[PDB]
Symmetry: C2
Subunit: 644 residues, 2 copies
């Protein structure tokens, strides 16, 4: 029978499979009779079946305290196919191989690494798999609520916590999405009567500003008018779409953390749930330097691409193409890091599985942080600075100049990077997660055995399925923490970032689910009280996110400069208006340059006693930026103090 969950005699559900074949140079007999006696003490091509009867599960459940299934009691009570796999795995790990020459091994952790065995896994049916396939696997059930209790009871506590965290995620990124939509409509509608994003488009005030080339050569004296196509759509990320949006984002990120702490407490109430500087930091410093190589490649790309060539402005198509190239390079370099972190972690002598995975987290998460967010931090914080008296950039300790931004507090490049990285990867990781299992399963089914007997045993089909590995949910937490960082660190621009995430996760909460019910082999239902080794990382990300949001609003949003302009530079002090009006902002902010243009920085005109040194406007604006940072951060940690 193809749907055989039992033995030949029947009435005995299979709990595990392990496969090996050492019948056939010279050394083969050694592992042959190593594994020949290994199964002997475990007793209470052929697929070695492992089952745990009542008297075995009862006698080996005494070691670990697990609340059996009304109400529950500690270790003993009276009123689960999932826990059998974990019990069998624990039995395999505890029972060792006894010899007479002092070479003792326990479990197959070392056995499968050497190569004695081939594979080991539990198996499920073809029931709870179909009912979970219909409303939870296929993307048609977008709005259907998931049975997280069923997920916990079927695919283990770790997967249940991962999905509940994702279920809780879009449960309250919909409010962030609707706030983003409100800011979206405010920015889009109020593109006319605000003297911003209309001055730039108007050829009389924001069109007569003759800039000067940003780089050394092969750039002409452009005009601000060309900014129109990207300035009219800039206000959506500016104005009220920036200040209250990011303040609400900070309050939200500080509050739902504690809200999900309460959710975790509720879950615990429901379920039981009871030399360093070198090499390691050397490679991180090397990639901190290698972002320079990445941007050098990016320039070497678009310099040629500009000569090669829906209102596709140069700074839109160029930025999109550059972001795609950088994303491809980031994926390749992430593959390189996936190799090197593993190759350096096993070099050190680690502790058991828990500490090994904790160290692997502490290394790979930082590797991915510096791999992904380095470019975003470069563009956001220290990209378009350092222009002085003769217009001399820092030159980066060489003969190569630095790149300069646009008169908007360059954020369109940042939001394009966000959209193409966290949005492009959203497509691409799902593409691999859906298609790689199909293509490899088809390769196995069309290259190993073809034309079966029309009755395929369950173990054979499961063996043909892809393994899940010990780093099962590590990669999902990694990608989701990357999404979390992109949706909380840089959420000042792109108000629709959670919404772009929202539907994303609604697909993922199915797609992953789908790949967890049809593609990968069933995983042992491990028990965990939380996400683990990521929650402190989440707290650190939130603490850094408050500061980085303040720095995004101040140093690279050009919102504080306009607030300052219509509060203190528009009034009769420093100005000629009557009340808080934003008129004349663009002309009365940019500073003049003498070639012997008008660049973006705030500096004195050529002939002030302090020429090309910062003026009163710059110092006022930077004092306002620092005050805004201090006030917002203090208010945010005060708010989280009230919350927790």
């Amino acid at each position: 029978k193809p749907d055989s969950l039992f033995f030949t005699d029947g009435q005995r559900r299979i709990d595990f499979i392990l496969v090996y074949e050492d019948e056939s140079k010279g050394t083969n007999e050694k592992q042959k009779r190593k594994r020949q006696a290994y199964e002997s003490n475990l007793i209470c091509l052929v697929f070695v079946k492992v089952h745990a009867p009542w008297e075995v599960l009862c006698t080996y459940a005494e070691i670990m305290h697990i609340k059996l299934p009304f109400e529950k009691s500690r270790m003993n009570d009276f009123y689960n196919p999932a826990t059998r796999s974990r019990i069998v795995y624990f039995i395999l790990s505890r029972v060792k191989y006894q010899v007479m020459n002092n070479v003792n091994k326990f479990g197959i952790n070392r056995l499968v690494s050497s190569g004695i065995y081939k594979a080991a896994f539990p198996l499920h049916d073809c029931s709870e798999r179909y009912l979970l396939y219909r409303e939870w696997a296929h993307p048609r059930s977008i709005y259907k609520k998931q049975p997280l209790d069923l997920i916990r009871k079927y695919y283990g506590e770790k997967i249940g916590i991962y999905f509940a965290w994702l279920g809780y995620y879009t449960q309250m990124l919909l409010l962030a999405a609707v706030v983003g939509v409100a800011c979206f409509l405010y920015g889009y509608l109020d593109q006319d009567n605000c003297t911003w994003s209309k001055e730039v488009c108007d050829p009389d005030i924001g069109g007569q500003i003759l800039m000067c080339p940003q780089c050394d050569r092969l750039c002409p004296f452009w005009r601000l008018n060309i900014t129109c196509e990207s300035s009219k759509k800039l206000c959506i990320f500016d104005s009220f779409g920036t200040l209250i949006f990011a303040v609400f984002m900070g309050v939200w990120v500080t509050l739902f953390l504690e809200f999900w702490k309460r959710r975790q407490a509720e879950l615990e109430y429901e379920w039981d749930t009871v030399l360093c500087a070198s090499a390691v930091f050397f490679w991180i410093l090397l990639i901190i330097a290698s972002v320079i190589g990445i941007i050098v490649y990016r320039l070497s790309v678009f310099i040629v691409f500009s000569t090669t060539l829906k209102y596709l402005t140069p700074q839109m198509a160029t930025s999109i193409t550059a972001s795609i190239i950088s994303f491809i390079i980031i994926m390749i370099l992430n593959t390189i890091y996936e190799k090197v972190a593993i190759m350096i972690t096993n070099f050190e002598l680690p502790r058991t599985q828990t500490d090994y995975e904790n160290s692997l987290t502490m290394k790979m998460f930082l590797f991915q942080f510096v791999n992904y967010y380095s470019s975003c931090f470069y563009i956001a914080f220290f990209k378009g600075k350092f222009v002085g008296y003769p217009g001399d950039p820092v030159y980066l300790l060489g003969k190569y100049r630095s790149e300069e931004c646009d008169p908007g507090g360059c954020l369109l490049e940042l939001t394009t990077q966000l959209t193409i990285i966290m949005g492009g990867k959203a497509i691409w990781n799902n593409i691999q997660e859906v298609l790689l299992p199909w293509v490899m399963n088809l390769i196995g089914r069309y290259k190993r055995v073809s034309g079966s007997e029309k009755i395929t045993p369950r173990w054979e089909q499961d063996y043909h399925l892809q393994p899940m590995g010990k780093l099962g949910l590590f990669y999902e937490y990694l990608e989701m923490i990357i999404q979390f960082g992109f949706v909380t660190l840089f959420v000042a621009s792109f108000p629709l970032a959670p919404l772009l995430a929202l539907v994303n996760n609604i697909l993922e909460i199915r797609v992953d689910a789908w790949k967890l019910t049809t593609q990968f082999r069933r995983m042992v239902p491990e028990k965990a009280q939380d996400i683990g080794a990521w929650q402190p990382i989440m707290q650190g990300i939130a603490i850094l996110a408050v500061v980085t949001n303040a720095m995004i609003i101040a140093f690279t949003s050009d919102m504080i400069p306009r607030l300052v302009y219509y509060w203190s530079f528009s009034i009769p002090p420093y100005g000629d208006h009557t009340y808080y009006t934003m008129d004349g902002y663009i002309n009365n902010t940019l500073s003049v340059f003498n070639i012997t243009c008008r660049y973006r920085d705030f500096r004195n005109p050529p002939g002030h006693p302090q020429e090309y040194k910062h003026n009163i406007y710059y110092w006022h604006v930077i004092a306002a930026k620092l005050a805004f940072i201090i006030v917002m951060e203090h208010i945010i940690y005060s708010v989280k103090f009230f919350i927790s």
Copy 2:
């Protein structure tokens, strides 16, 4: 037998002592002692069997071999066990009137007193080598305190330990910067040009008050500016940075010590009324400053005793007296409002009492210091018009030094004067009241005084025993970490203080007060969150003290970016010409302290580039120092 801790039979030590409407409580107390059986001095004793029987509920692990109570491998714990037995056993009636313990019994007034008794031994040696003026510097046997006076007193004297041993490092760093500020005093152009009449005495000021104040000169500042040098020349920066690192160090260092002692020992409507009085005292600090002004204004009409030294001392003493009187009033009112609300058990009641009285004392003490440090000498504009505080009364203005001598004088007189006065009461009140009792109740005994009689004549300690000591020491901690930029000797002033206090309290805990029940405690309790909040606020307030009220960042700015060919006619990083080129001119139709444009700049009396540069430096300094400090404590923890 005056030294008799046993009954007539002997070999049975006393473990505790307790001593038409009248008939009601007479009958209630007559049957109360009946179920407890296993002026009269009821000697409650606990044999071994009752100790084992009713010590099982409160799990205590004590042997050598610390495994569990029921093992086969302490005069202190008998009092606690007897107290627990008294509290658990209730009085049974047939009218639905059930009372357990004497917490309600002594409140009504059926009994008079209840206390354990100690020896006249382990108390004599502990008086000599630990509680005597001849043994001040001798090392503490903290075990001899833990097993004799209880976990609470032991934790109090161990937490006070590091204020005597490793507060010495802070004190010696303070001494080092104290001597550094006095040696490099002539060759810094600061506090020398001020004392030089040629360039620092020609700067005529203008009156700070509306009337009865003449146009003075900076020359008179000399006697207070020359000694100001040690407070802010260069020792303030490294001093406060080291203080922040030091506090964010010993917090976790004492966490480690707490873990070590855990290894050693077992240790098993709101907006109104409550916040209304706090906002009322926030307003009443205005009344306090009005009172101090009214005092020294008249005193002005009445060893280089400059007006701003004698005045700052006299007004500080008057404010300290008023603060003590108000603290008595708050001790009354917090108790009178806390019992109004229906509280939980004793632990939660004392937690609420902590949360109320600590805030009351915070606003009582640190409000004046925050007023002087942060928002005292500001708000001068175009015609020299102060904010007037929503009235016809002007505000008070500071001196061209980033007024800090007033702040350090307030610290020295408050945390130093109280350091004397609290010890004075703690030493003399027991003597005077014991003498009153011994010379007014019974005189001329028969030369044999029973132990219980002498103990009864001693003062009671109460349920709020160590609450006041934690309160005063947390006040000292706040004064030595919040405002530790000036007065580098503040730890050293504390140090000997603590070295005396760690005896004085010790002394008063072996001769004056009645023995206290050895309560079970694993930490100071309900104060560690307060200490963490104090440290987090302390980093920020130290940054604001260095920036907004130290006049140090302006001194960095002058010789970094104003003594260079832009903004200055110099050639290096030199402090020359700082005083003249910082204060801004005022036109009456003087030269005040704030940084504003001269009378005739297109933005007249609006702020110049100097103030905006200095405030940008201040904000950058605050941000950088705070970020570095929490990064450092992240590395530490």
